[PDB]
Amino acid sequence: GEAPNQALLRILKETEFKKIKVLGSGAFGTVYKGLWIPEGEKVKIPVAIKELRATSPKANKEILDEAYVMASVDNPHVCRLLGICLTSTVQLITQLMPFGCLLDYVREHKDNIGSQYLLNWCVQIAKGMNYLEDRRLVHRDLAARNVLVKTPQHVKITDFGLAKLLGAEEKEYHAEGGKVPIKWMALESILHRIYTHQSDVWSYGVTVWELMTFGSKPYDGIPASEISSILEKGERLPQPPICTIDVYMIMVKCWMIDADSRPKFRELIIEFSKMARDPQRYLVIQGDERMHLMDEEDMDDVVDADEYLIP
């Protein structure tokens, strides 16, 4: 009737891993960096570990839903669950992504990110998303904050809270508890709480826009109430400065009204691959190589004394 989900859910002992330091104490719990040392083996695996504070009644069924889907994915551009630990409070264990979320990263390194990294990230995210679509899965929260950085050359999608499965028969998902980030959401999602792989494509467009802007807040001024209307009026996010029309047009197609006329992730991979073979033709970034005499002002007639000889 549907494909059986034969994913393993590993149970891990509290003793076989050491928390080292807190990475993030949000209102969603806290996440530690840690080391997982399975006793059987002779390995040590850098991990991230997530738990929530009291047992919130629903929220403990929420984190186990996240566990369910993180354990059900296996792609190089998607964070997989390593195991759960059933202590007083449940802990999710996953591979450590040392450089944190992409959003922070484009901000903390604006001046040192070239077109090849930007376009290669766009490829990689579309592969991750094309995989989740192959696995009949709808993320419902794609955003630059929810893409983590293993290295600057390798990013993966994460945060599978909110993610939902869809059999062969359904093409859609009707949410109820509407607390989803408004500014990454398709129109159909904001109006009718409909979620499709093509609504993920919209959120992909907004994610790409975040990156090409080195981490700007979309609709930076505007409040969530309005978003529905101005998107309906036909307004969209502006063309980022570094973006050619070629790139910006792909974004805009992710933001069409008719969801079926937006591009498929399998297409976004192709089109961004093509572009990543000649990056500087499609993204113009002042200084696009390396910016390395440490003066900190604006001067184009600076010469070095070693090249200024006896007048």
Ligand SMILES: CN(C)C/C=C/C(=O)Nc1cccc(-c2c(-c3ccccc3)oc3ncnc(N[C@H](CO)c4ccccc4)c23)c1
């Ligand atoms: C809000 N803005 C700041 C945008 C960016 C937000 C952000 O990066 N938050 C975040 C919060 C907590 C941990 C992490 C986080 C970091 C990290 C590493 C170094 C510095 C900072 C973070 O490394 C991670 N590796 C794997 N999963 C992670 N974290 C998810 C939680 O979803 C997870 C862990 C275990 C199991 C499942 C999932 C993280 C990332």
